Amino acid sequence: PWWNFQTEHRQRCVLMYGGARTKNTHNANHRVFIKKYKRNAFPNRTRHHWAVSMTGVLSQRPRRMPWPYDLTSLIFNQPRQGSDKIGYVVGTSMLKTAVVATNHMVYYPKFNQRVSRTKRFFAHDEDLACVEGDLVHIKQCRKISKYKHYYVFSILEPNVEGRERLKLGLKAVPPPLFGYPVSRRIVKLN
Amino acid sequence: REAFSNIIAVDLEQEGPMYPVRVNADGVRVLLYPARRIVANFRVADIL
Amino acid sequence: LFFLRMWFLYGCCLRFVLFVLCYYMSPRLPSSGNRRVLYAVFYLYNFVWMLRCFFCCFIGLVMSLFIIEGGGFVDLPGVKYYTRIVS
Amino acid sequence: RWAAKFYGQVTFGPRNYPYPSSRWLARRFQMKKHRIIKRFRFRRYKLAAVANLPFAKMIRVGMLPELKSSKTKRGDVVDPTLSGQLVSAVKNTGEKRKGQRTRPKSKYQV
Amino acid sequence: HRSGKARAFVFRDPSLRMMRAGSGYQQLRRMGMPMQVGMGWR
Amino acid sequence: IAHWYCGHKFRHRFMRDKRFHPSLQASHDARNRFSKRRHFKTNRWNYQQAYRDMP
RNA sequence: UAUGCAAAUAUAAAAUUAUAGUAAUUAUAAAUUAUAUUAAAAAGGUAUUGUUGCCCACCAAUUUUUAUAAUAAAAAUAACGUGCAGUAAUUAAUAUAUUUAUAAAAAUAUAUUUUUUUUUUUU
RNA sequence: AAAAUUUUAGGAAUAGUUAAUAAUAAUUUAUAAUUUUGAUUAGAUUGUUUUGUUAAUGCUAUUAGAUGGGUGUGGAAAAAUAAAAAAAAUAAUUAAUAUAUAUCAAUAAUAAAUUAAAUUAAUCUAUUAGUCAGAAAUGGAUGCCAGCCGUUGCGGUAAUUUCUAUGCUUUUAAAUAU
Ligand SMILES: [Mg+2]
Ligand SMILES: [Mg+2]
Ligand SMILES: [Mg+2]
Ligand SMILES: [Mg+2]
Ligand SMILES: [Mg+2]
Ligand SMILES: [Mg+2]
Ligand SMILES: [Mg+2]
Ligand SMILES: [Mg+2]
Ligand SMILES: [Mg+2]
Ligand SMILES: [Mg+2]
Ligand SMILES: [Mg+2]
Ligand SMILES: [Mg+2]
Ligand SMILES: [Mg+2]
Ligand SMILES: [Mg+2]
Ligand SMILES: [Mg+2]
Numbered sequence A: 001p002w003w004n005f006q007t008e009h010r011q012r013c014v015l016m017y018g019g020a021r022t023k024n025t026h027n028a029n030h031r032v033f034i035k036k037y038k039r040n041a042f043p044n045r046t047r048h049h050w051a052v053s054m055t056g057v058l059s060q061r062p063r064r065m066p067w068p069y070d071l072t073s074l075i076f077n078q079p080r081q082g083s084d085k086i087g088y089v090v091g092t093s094m095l096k097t098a099v100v101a102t103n104h105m106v107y108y109p110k111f112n113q114r115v116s117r118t119k120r121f122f123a124h125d126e127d128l129a130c131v132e133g134d135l136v137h138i139k140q141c142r143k144i145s146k147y148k149h150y151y152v153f154s155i156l157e158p159n160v161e162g163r164e165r166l167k168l169g170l171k172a173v174p175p176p177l178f179g180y181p182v183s184r185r186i187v188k189l190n
Numbered sequence B: 001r002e003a004f005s006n007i008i009a010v011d012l013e014q015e016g017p018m019y020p021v022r023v024n025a026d027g028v029r030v031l032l033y034p035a036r037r038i039v040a041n042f043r044v045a046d047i048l
Numbered sequence C: 001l002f003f004l005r006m007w008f009l010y011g012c013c014l015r016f017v018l019f020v021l022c023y024y025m026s027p028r029l030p031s032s033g034n035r036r037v038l039y040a041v042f043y044l045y046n047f048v049w050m051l052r053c054f055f056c057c058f059i060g061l062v063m064s065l066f067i068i069e070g071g072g073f074v075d076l077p078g079v080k081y082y083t084r085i086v087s
Numbered sequence D: 001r002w003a004a005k006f007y008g009q010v011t012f013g014p015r016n017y018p019y020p021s022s023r024w025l026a027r028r029f030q031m032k033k034h035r036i037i038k039r040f041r042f043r044r045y046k047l048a049a050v051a052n053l054p055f056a057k058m059i060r061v062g063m064l065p066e067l068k069s070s071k072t073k074r075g076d077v078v079d080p081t082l083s084g085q086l087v088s089a090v091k092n093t094g095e096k097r098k099g100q101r102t103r104p105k106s107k108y109q110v
Numbered sequence E: 001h002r003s004g005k006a007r008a009f010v011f012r013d014p015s016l017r018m019m020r021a022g023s024g025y026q027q028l029r030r031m032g033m034p035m036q037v038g039m040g041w042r
Numbered sequence F: 001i002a003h004w005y006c007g008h009k010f011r012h013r014f015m016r017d018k019r020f021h022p023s024l025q026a027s028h029d030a031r032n033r034f035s036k037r038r039h040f041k042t043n044r045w046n047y048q049q050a051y052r053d054m055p
Numbered sequence G: 001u002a003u004g005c006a007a008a009u010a011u012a013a014a015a016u017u018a019u020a021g022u023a024a025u026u027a028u029a030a031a032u033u034a035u036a037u038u039a040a041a042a043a044g045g046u047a048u049u050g051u052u053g054c055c056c057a058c059c060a061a062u063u064u065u066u067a068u069a070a071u072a073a074a075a076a077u078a079a080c081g082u083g084c085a086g087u088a089a090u091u092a093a094u095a096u097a098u099u100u101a102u103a104a105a106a107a108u109a110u111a112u113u114u115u116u117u118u119u120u121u122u123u
Numbered sequence H: 001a002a003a004a005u006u007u008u009a010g011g012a013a014u015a016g017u018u019a020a021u022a023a024u025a026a027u028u029u030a031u032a033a034u035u036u037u038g039a040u041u042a043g044a045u046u047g048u049u050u051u052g053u054u055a056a057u058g059c060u061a062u063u064a065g066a067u068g069g070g071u072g073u074g075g076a077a078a079a080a081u082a083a084a085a086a087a088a089a090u091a092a093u094u095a096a097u098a099u100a101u102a103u104c105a106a107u108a109a110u111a112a113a114u115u116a117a118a119u120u121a122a123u124c125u126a127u128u129a130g131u132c133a134g135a136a137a138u139g140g141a142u143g144c145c146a147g148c149c150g151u152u153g154c155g156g157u158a159a160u161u162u163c164u165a166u167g168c169u170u171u172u173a174a175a176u177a178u
């Protein structure tokens, strides 16, 4: 009985009246980190592990938990979570495939506040309507290819500027000026 | 005589504070709150 | 609480060690004398570590392994571990 | 700037101390900074950061076999072409060419 | 102490401490928010 | 705060917690929170003529 | 003495030191300290019965951790030998910058008082 | 078939590789895919009703169990010791007892001291600490030594702080270490 003191205990086999039957897991173990590597040479390029690493997911402090309540569930009644998503079309390099960036929500109960994260999806548009920078509605469906479970259900907002831009033979959107960041210094002149 | 100069009194109609008092003496932050009984450090307790 | 002094207990309350050397060291002023320091060895995950600890114990007939416990601070700077009994 | 302004925390005084540092503390840390800098000068340190290379990792040129000060310690292993170019850089840094901007010179730079 | 923890000038009203706790993890577990995806207690 | 997580000091724990803080999260404005300085002055000498297909 | 290069006190932080394993802390400001030309009256202390007070680096041994740069780094430390760097302290100190070097440190260029003050409302 | 939640103080690229065609292609077609909104390698780690502390948003635990294919059986690979699941006639239920082994659990100093056990009398013979500050001291040594040290600190022939002897102190599941 977890509500009884150290000295008050008689039998360890049963709860006499009611309450919760509780196993004590020993939380304070003084667990330690073993140091197997020199501070100079650690066998990873991007990150180094010098201390005890916190583990689990949802057991992870500060807790970050799935938030069903956001814009997407606000507008839709979803049969299954993530069955509907609203997003923007980012890039079409693949035939009958629209990549879509979408936002979802995370809740930190410690600070009592929400964050928006973002995630990319492959959606299947047969007939190739979607131009980069469309606002689209997207649904869960039959497995189509290795990574496509989603199809374009409706175009909410098409890109009129982008379409007229295509009609003239130009790319839908200008290609981004710089790519991913580097740790080098590129000296390229003229 | 310095203690009799500073004498305070308390209205006991209510027998204990009815709201929290949050107040600091020099560098010492004190909380005086309503309780079911008297709970405090031994010294603070027989002061109260 | 100072948690880095316990480095060689490795999350344990007591340790088992083997005797190697016993030398003497002089404490931080204004404390004069000779503090007896035993230089001990033990192994963990097939690594052999040399532990250095304060000898407060009672030695009888010749014996080898001791039991190490961590304390508070002592006169002698740099020696964290203390001796419980000798086996 | 690349190098460190300070070494250790030079402003430690009580809160609302109405200066960045006290005289005492700043003197202690001035001592430590002094020792480190003097070490850099006498051992003749040289560092380099090369374009199209990871920058945070700086080739230490003062340890290179040609420019190494010690006669004993094994210096470092740097690419033959790159090391030749580093040697040439260190060498042709030394003296003032007219029309070029005057840059501070020292014994320990050679 | 420029190098050290920030201290409150006075205490915090305990009542407010209890009012800001409404949506905390325990209350959520009681509301049933987290999905039970594993065996849990036996 | 358990002492085994992160560094041997306490404040290392709160320095890695600032990595998870809700209002501190990475977005289109605040980027490269963890290494800002490796990417600094990286493109200074990289000369890129901007993209114009329209007059 | 601002045509190359050069982010950087104006503060978002969780006890001091320490490259984030070393020692057990550190830092701090108003008590006290006899001579600055008023018809005798304004003054500073890293000491704490207080200058015969304290302290600073190099220069040996050793102890211990490691990210081994003339001669690795850092921390404990009670020898020997140089001096006299600091306490407005025998050319005031403090921070950055550049140079210099038995060792504290010293020279110069800027900011500045955790340095002591000297004061023309059109002559 | 998917969606959410995913760790390392000081952070760079990853790759039988994306999407369309189709029961195609070790050389089909294409301006492909993952990454700084932190990837892939690499360390540590058994993932989303289990604990401890707490007045409380917190902090701090939770085991264990799914490790590729290669005549592919089978409804389903979960298929090479390690039960405590009655397994095609009611084996048996007067049974819960299992002797001396193990693994990781499972909190036993159970009126710890005076009037006796509405028994079936079976297991056990059971103790520590302090003694400057702060409940409790005197002899005797020792002389900056030996030693004490939770902590300020103690030890310089008178030590209420060391050692020893004897008393004396405790609010009685022990001190000590983590
Ligand atoms: Mg530990
Ligand atoms: Mg002590
Ligand atoms: Mg200087
Ligand atoms: Mg000129
Ligand atoms: Mg060593
Ligand atoms: Mg050294
Ligand atoms: Mg002097
Ligand atoms: Mg001077
Ligand atoms: Mg002077
Ligand atoms: Mg100066
Ligand atoms: Mg000099
Ligand atoms: Mg100087
Ligand atoms: Mg096989
Ligand atoms: Mg007493
Ligand atoms: Mg004793």
Ligand SMILES: [Mg+2]
Pocket: H157
């Ligand atoms: Mg005697």
Ligand SMILES: [Mg+2]
Pocket: none
């Ligand atoms: Mg006595």
